[PDB]
Structures are given as C-alpha cells and as structure tokens.
Amino acid sequence: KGPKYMAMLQKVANRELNSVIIDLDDILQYQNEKFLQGTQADDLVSAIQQNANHFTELFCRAIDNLTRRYFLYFKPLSQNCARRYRISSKPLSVRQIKGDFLGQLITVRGIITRVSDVKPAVEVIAYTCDQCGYEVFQEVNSRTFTPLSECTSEECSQNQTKGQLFMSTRASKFSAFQECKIQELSQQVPVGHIPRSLNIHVNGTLVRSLSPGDIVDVTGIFLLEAQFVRQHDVEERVMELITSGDVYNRLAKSIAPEIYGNLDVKKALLLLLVGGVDKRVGDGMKIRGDINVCLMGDPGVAKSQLLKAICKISPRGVYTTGKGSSGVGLTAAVMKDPVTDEMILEGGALVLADNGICCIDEFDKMDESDRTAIHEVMEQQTISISKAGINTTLNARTSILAAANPLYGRYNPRLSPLDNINLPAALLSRFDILFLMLDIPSRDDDEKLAEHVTYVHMHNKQPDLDFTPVEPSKMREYIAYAKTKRPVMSEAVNDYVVQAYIRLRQDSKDSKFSFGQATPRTLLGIIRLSQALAKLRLADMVDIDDVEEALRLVRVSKESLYQ
Amino acid sequence: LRIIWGTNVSIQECTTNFRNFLMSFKYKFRKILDERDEELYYIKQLNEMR
Known part of the structure; x- marks a missing residue:
C-alpha cells in the first residue's frame, strides 16, 4: 500500500478492476499541503469543474505515462469538505439549469421513471485488410456514422490498387451505453x-447502478454524461409543537381547517399519512405496514378539498382520476422514442409516487383493469407484469386513499350496504377503514357549516378559537421525526387485543344493516393503527390507550349509518 | 515468425503443436487432471470416421 493511486494502478495491473474513481477531497488535501509549504497551488478544483470532457482525456494520458484497460470517472466534494477551508457541488433542479451550465459538473436530485436496456455502443471502428495488413481505426462521436470503404492506410496511398476493407467486431472498442x-x-x-424531465446518457460500469423507482443524486457533466451516482432550529420547531398540550388533537384539527368538523375521518387520515411500522420476519416474508382508507359518501360535503390538502401537505402526492389515460396511467405501457430507434416504457401514477399517498378520485367510475392493479398493490408491495416486452417485478410501497360514491349518487336506507x-x-x-361520510339535514348542526363557509368566503382567516393552525413544515417535520419510531406491544394490551378480537369475530359472524365480517387483516390494521398512535406519542411501547381509541375509531367509522 | 495484427497466434508453430498433440495422446487427463489400457485415442476415431 502507501501511495493509494499507485496501489490502484497495481490493482489494475493485477487485472482485478476496471473502474477508476477520482475524488476532489484528495485534490483539496494536496492543495492544502502544497499551499502550506509556500509552493504555488495552481488550482485544480476551479479547473476540473469546467470542461471535464477535456480533463478526462488529458489526465488519462498522465495516468498512462485504444489500449485503455480501465475507465476513468469522477466524483465531487461534499458540503462537509466545502465548509472546511472555505459551491462546486450543489443539489441542482432541472428548472435551475439556466441554459449556461452546459459544461459544469452538476449534482441533480430526482426520481427515475424511464430507464433503458444496456446496449453496446461503439467508440472506435476497426477495419482490417488482407492486402497490406495495417489495421486502421476510426473514431466516431455522433449517434450515426458512415462506413469508410476507401482505404486510408500508409501503403495504399503510394499504390494503384485500392483493395477492399473489412470490419472487426472484436478489436473494436465498445461501451455499455444506457439512456435515462x-x-x-x-x-x-x-x-x-x-415536473419536467431531462436526459442522462451513462456509459461503462455505472450502467447497472440505476434501477427505476428510486430517488438519486447524479453527478456528471452537462453536454448528461454521468460520472457518479448515489441514493438515499429544527429541535425548537418540534419541541414548541409538543409543549402546547394535546398534540394528537391539535395536529388533527390543524390540517385542512377550511372544512367543517369530521375530526374522526381526518384523524384517521393523520394516522394514514404517518404510515406505521413495516414488519419483516427475516425468513422471506414481508407484511404491509400501511393503511388504506375509503371515503364513501353522498354529494354535498367536500371531498376533493381533503384529498388535495393531504396531497399538498404530504410529499410525493399524486392526484389521479377515474377515466381517461388511467388504464395506461396505472401500469407501464410501451411507446416509440422520438430521439432514437427504440421502445421505452411509460410509467403510471404508482411509480413516480413511490413512498407516499396515492389518491383515487371517483373510485366507482373506473374499470376492472384499474381495480386488478389497485388491489395488487393494496395487498402487497410489488407490481407483477406478464405482457410482451417487459417482465419485471416493480417495488412499490404506497398508501391508497380512495373517494367513492354509491350506485344512485346518495345513500339508500332501504338498501343493504353490500x-x-x-x-x-x-x-x-x-x-380496514371505510368512512360512510353521510350527510343528514338538521336544524342546529347545519348552521355551523354555513357560518364556517361564510367566514372562510368573507376572508382567508380561520375562526377565532383559542388555537392557531400549524403551517405545513412543522407537522411535516413531526411526521418525519415520528416515522423513525418502532413501538413494541406489551402483554397487558395483548390480553385486551385478543379478547376484543374474539368478541368482534363472534359478534360479526348477518342482517339488513350488516356488511362484511371480521378478518385477520382488520386485526393487523388495528395493530398498525395502535403502532401509529404510539408513534404519534413518540413512545417506544404500545399502551392500552391506543387500542381503545382504534376500536372506537373503527366502530364510529360505521356508526353514522344509524343517523 | 508470422504475427497477425491483434492476434498472438502463429500459423506454423500452432500447426506443428496441433499435429504433435494429434499424433500422440493417450489419456493424459486421466493421469494428471485429477487423482482418478487404451492406446491412440485420436488415431482410432479419425481412422473410424473416414
């Protein structure tokens, strides 16, 4: 060991690796060592950042001091090495490109929806002759090229004969090209x-580091030729939200205050967007740690507003529809690329929203093809396809929010709920949770809804109650802080859970107002809601107070039919 | 010494060693490839197939 770059050259001389990674941290430390000794620095980090395509062909010959056994790549410095010694690697948006950054190394953050297959793209074309023996090599740069049938050797220039040339697919250097x-x-x-897109052209050993359905940070030059990829004041903001008292009810009534009441439905929406605990048995079996909520109701009460507020507060929320391009908007279809002669797959609404809330407006207006794909991600976490062109297994962990209406628009009390x-x-x-948001006309309760809508239409401010509505960043930070908690159930809550499950199963197992039966998935959802309630209280254990709240929640979710 | 471009294969030397292997081979893989009667293993098959 010792001089690590010479050891890496010994390792590539031992023929064990084919990738060369150069960091700017070693450049910064060598610059510090040269600057502290009174020598001239002659800055590399301000020169590597602009025109890296000339530097990857210029420093390669210095390492070398057609026969390229290795592949040269770069990686930028982090922010921790940027604050130390006092930029070049900032997380850039595609709206923050400005046009003039064509040729700077940029680190872009984003999701990946479209990927292509690995294909061999030639770099140099090798031609062989039998008349002279001097094999020639031409270099291509564009997408297309022309065959050099005329001989340009050093022996056919001084000759009358200009004999035929042939191509070699073995001596020609190729590269694993892939577009994304x-x-x-x-x-x-x-x-x-x-959210507009951008194209990234990768080559070499980085070709299998990009699997679709993920968030990535891509560092590369902008012609995008990637070089390196990676994948994934605040305490005062969480402690002032905790110290006010009654954290659960405050966070319940804080989200979506432009509507009237319905604290239970939106309280379960709070437990829905907090998610829960994903359980792994470690023996090849994974169960869901997610909730899926139905909103069945009659028109008159607002339905798209709660759905829009949930998708606006929670990150990666994608609004969907019932009809239209929904059949291709829930699965990966195929299309012809307008930039090259290849077929690519178009992703649906379940692939750009990987970890988050996936909502469906007008659930009964869809078809069987949408329902068969919605039920498949509703049961487990992977998408399975069997058509011609792609046969992969797509990972997807989404929470399904659904909004539906009955057969005749509103409800019917003479009809059974099945x-x-x-x-x-x-x-x-x-x-597990279906909300029968049924409207009943009354004399006293309708005036509060009328007073609330006239108050929010008079001005943008909320009613004068002794509570202030919390902004999206603070409870977004609270949801992100509560999501790392892993609660464990006790034995005293275990003996209450099994007795309530036995009594619920016996009570469920067949008349006019009945609907469904008790399933073990509802028991697992009750366990998940208790884990979410313990996660919202930031506790390491599950108490008796969560199960009695969850059972009250699931029974009052169906108790509105008697009104 | 004839050398093809991009190839480490000489014609006459490989021709002579291929002929030397073909005129003389009697189950050497049974003796030195592992720790696990006949004569002229390749002459009999080539004289049979013609």
Whole structure:
C-alpha cells in the first residue's frame, strides 16, 4: 500500500478492476499541503469543474505515462469538505439549469421513471485488410456514422490498387451505453408548474447502478454524461409543537381547517399519512405496514378539498382520476422514442409516487383493469407484469386513499350496504377503514357549516378559537421525526387485543344493516393503527390507550349509518 | 515468425503443436487432471470416421 493511486494502478495491473474513481477531497488535501509549504497551488478544483470532457482525456494520458484497460470517472466534494477551508457541488433542479451550465459538473436530485436496456455502443471502428495488413481505426462521436470503404492506410496511398476493407467486431472498442430520464422532485417544483424531465446518457460500469423507482443524486457533466451516482432550529420547531398540550388533537384539527368538523375521518387520515411500522420476519416474508382508507359518501360535503390538502401537505402526492389515460396511467405501457430507434416504457401514477399517498378520485367510475392493479398493490408491495416486452417485478410501497360514491349518487336506507356499495367483498375486506361520510339535514348542526363557509368566503382567516393552525413544515417535520419510531406491544394490551378480537369475530359472524365480517387483516390494521398512535406519542411501547381509541375509531367509522 | 495484427497466434508453430498433440495422446487427463489400457485415442476415431 502507501501511495493509494499507485496501489490502484497495481490493482489494475493485477487485472482485478476496471473502474477508476477520482475524488476532489484528495485534490483539496494536496492543495492544502502544497499551499502550506509556500509552493504555488495552481488550482485544480476551479479547473476540473469546467470542461471535464477535456480533463478526462488529458489526465488519462498522465495516468498512462485504444489500449485503455480501465475507465476513468469522477466524483465531487461534499458540503462537509466545502465548509472546511472555505459551491462546486450543489443539489441542482432541472428548472435551475439556466441554459449556461452546459459544461459544469452538476449534482441533480430526482426520481427515475424511464430507464433503458444496456446496449453496446461503439467508440472506435476497426477495419482490417488482407492486402497490406495495417489495421486502421476510426473514431466516431455522433449517434450515426458512415462506413469508410476507401482505404486510408500508409501503403495504399503510394499504390494503384485500392483493395477492399473489412470490419472487426472484436478489436473494436465498445461501451455499455444506457439512456435515462431524470424527473423533477415533487416539493422542489414551483407553484402550479409540472415536473419536467431531462436526459442522462451513462456509459461503462455505472450502467447497472440505476434501477427505476428510486430517488438519486447524479453527478456528471452537462453536454448528461454521468460520472457518479448515489441514493438515499429544527429541535425548537418540534419541541414548541409538543409543549402546547394535546398534540394528537391539535395536529388533527390543524390540517385542512377550511372544512367543517369530521375530526374522526381526518384523524384517521393523520394516522394514514404517518404510515406505521413495516414488519419483516427475516425468513422471506414481508407484511404491509400501511393503511388504506375509503371515503364513501353522498354529494354535498367536500371531498376533493381533503384529498388535495393531504396531497399538498404530504410529499410525493399524486392526484389521479377515474377515466381517461388511467388504464395506461396505472401500469407501464410501451411507446416509440422520438430521439432514437427504440421502445421505452411509460410509467403510471404508482411509480413516480413511490413512498407516499396515492389518491383515487371517483373510485366507482373506473374499470376492472384499474381495480386488478389497485388491489395488487393494496395487498402487497410489488407490481407483477406478464405482457410482451417487459417482465419485471416493480417495488412499490404506497398508501391508497380512495373517494367513492354509491350506485344512485346518495345513500339508500332501504338498501343493504353490500348492495349499496358496488365494490366486491375482497376489495373492502382488504380495506380496514371505510368512512360512510353521510350527510343528514338538521336544524342546529347545519348552521355551523354555513357560518364556517361564510367566514372562510368573507376572508382567508380561520375562526377565532383559542388555537392557531400549524403551517405545513412543522407537522411535516413531526411526521418525519415520528416515522423513525418502532413501538413494541406489551402483554397487558395483548390480553385486551385478543379478547376484543374474539368478541368482534363472534359478534360479526348477518342482517339488513350488516356488511362484511371480521378478518385477520382488520386485526393487523388495528395493530398498525395502535403502532401509529404510539408513534404519534413518540413512545417506544404500545399502551392500552391506543387500542381503545382504534376500536372506537373503527366502530364510529360505521356508526353514522344509524343517523 | 508470422504475427497477425491483434492476434498472438502463429500459423506454423500452432500447426506443428496441433499435429504433435494429434499424433500422440493417450489419456493424459486421466493421469494428471485429477487423482482418478487404451492406446491412440485420436488415431482410432479419425481412422473410424473416414
């Protein structure tokens, strides 16, 4: 060992590796060592950052001091090495490109929706002759080229004969080329704008470091020729939200205050966007640690506003629809690329929203093709396809929010709920929480809804209650801080859980107002909601107070039918 | 010494060693490839197939 770059050259001379990684931290330390000894620095870090395509062909010959056994790549310095000794590597958006950054090394952050297959692209074309023996090599740079049928050797110039040349697919140097489409991040896009894409052209050993359905930080030159990829004041803001008292009810009534009441439905929406605990048995079996909430209701009460507020507060929230391009908007279809002669896959709405809230407006207006793909990600976490062109398994961990209406628009008290709801038993049997948001006309309670809508239409401010509505950043930080908690259930809550489950199963196992039966998935959802309630209290254990709240929640979710 | 461009294969030397292996080979892989009667293993097959 010792001089690590010479040891890496010994390792490439031992023929064990083919990738060369150069960091700017060693450059900064060598610059510090040269500057502290009174020698001239002659800065490299301000010269590597501009025109790296000339530097990757110029420093390669200095390492060398057609026969390239290795592949040269770069990586930038972090912010920790940027604050030390007092930029070049900032997280850039695709809206923050400005046009004039064509040729700077940039680190872009974003999701990846479109990827292509690995294909061999030639760099130099080798031609062989039988008349002279001097094999020639031409260099291509563009997407296309022309065959050099005329001989340009050093022996055919001084000759009458100009004999035929042939090509060699073995002596020609190829490269594992792959194109990818990076997309703009959801909370980094401005107000009203859409997340536009950008193209990244990778080559060599980085060709298998990009699997779709993830967030990546790509560092490369901008012609995008990637060089290195990677993947994934605040305490005062969380402690002042905690210290006010009644954290759960304050965080419940803080989100979406432009509507009237319904603290229970939106309280379960709070437990829905906090997610829960993903459980792994470590023996090849993974169960869901997610909730899926149905909102079945009659028109008159607002439904798109709660859905829009949940997608606006939570990150990566994607608004969907029932009809239109939904059939291709829920699965990966195929299309012809307008920049090259290849077929690519277009991703649906379940692939750009990987870890988050996936919402469906007008659930009964869809078809069987949408339902068969929604039920598959509702049960487990992977998308399976069997059509011609792609046969992969796509990872997806999404929380399904659904908004639906009955068969005749509103409800019917003379009809059973199994006949009022057109969805089959396997769909709502998987649904742990279904909210029958039914409107009933009254004399006293309707005046408060009328007073609230006239107060929010008079001015943008909320009613004068002794509570202030919390901004999106603070509870977004609270949800991100509560998500790392892993609560463990006790034995005293275990004996209450099994007795309530036995009594609920016996009570469930067949009349006019009945609907469904008790399933073990509902017991698992009750366990997940208790874990979410313990995660919202930031506790390491699950107490008796969460199960009695969750059972009250799931029973009052269906108790509105008697009104 | 004839050398093809980009190839480390000489014609006459490989021709002579291929002929030397073909005129003389009697189950040497049974003796030195592992720790696990006949004569002229390649002459009999080539004289049979013609």
